[PDB]
Amino acid sequence: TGETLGEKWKARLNQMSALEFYSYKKSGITEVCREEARRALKDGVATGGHAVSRGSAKLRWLVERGYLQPYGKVIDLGCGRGGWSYYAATIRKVQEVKGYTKGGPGHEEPMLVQSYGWNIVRLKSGVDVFHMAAEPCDTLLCDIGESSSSPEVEEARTLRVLSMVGDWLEKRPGAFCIKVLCPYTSTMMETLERLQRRYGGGLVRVPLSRNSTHEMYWVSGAKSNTIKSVSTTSQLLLGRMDGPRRPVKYEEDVNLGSGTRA
């Protein structure tokens, strides 16, 4: 014993055969159709309203449910191509969005499309956020966390993220959404519950997430129990390994429109 359910799921995950993992990573998950979005971005239709990545539909799913209500100044730590930034520009109460990513050889460089509100969005690449000082903001976004086959490695990097956002949350942002890659260890649930008492909010699982990751999102509009919501998600991914394979629930990708904003 000694293992959490999430630590049990990870061990079983690492022991699946090639196809067993292949047919499981998207068994029963929701997924937006990205075929026509890439073809228009590959060609260059910047005013078609196409999302730059799958991150737009994931963040949209959270906002269309009030899991957070962005407004005012928005900071997007780890913007990559800008899926979260280009969607936040379409929110009415949002007035300004600033993005920061690393980019480089093995990372995503920001894309410049013109969906609705593109003129208020800036994406500065080559920025290490862990060495960047925190600014006062209205809403804070963070989608940083690379996957590892080791739960202890995912633990360490997830903790590095939550310490970094500690000074950003200290700038009293009104709303926030922070990616929690590994929330299933004993220390994480201890850590997250400590940050919750202090900064509020709650942990949420997104159906668009693959079953190959235990990531959950720490949003400001939720008030779910720390240990209960994780264990519910740990049991979900475990139950999806045992039974028969399930189809993917496809849905239409988000369209962000076009045009400028004053």
Ligand SMILES: Nc1nc2c(ncn2[C@@H]2O[C@H](COP(=O)(O)OP(=O)(O)OP(=O)(O)O)[C@@H](O)[C@H]2O)c(=O)[nH]1
């Ligand atoms: N048994 C098995 N487990 C894997 C494999 N690849 C990843 N896992 C696990 O998947 C976790 C995260 O996978 P990701 O690479 O981030 O995303 P993905 O679901 O694998 O998507 P793909 O890269 O297309 O396979 C890793 O931490 C590994 O623990 C594999 O090939 N076989």
Ligand SMILES: Nc1ncnc2c1ncn2[C@@H]1O[C@H](CSCC[C@H](N)C(=O)O)[C@@H](O)[C@H]1O
């Ligand atoms: N220490 C760091 N500082 C700044 N950016 C980092 C970073 N570590 C990783 N990143 C970047 O953060 C990004 C997170 S993936 C972001 C995807 C985005 N939310 C979308 O919807 O498109 C990656 O592209 C990675 O290159």
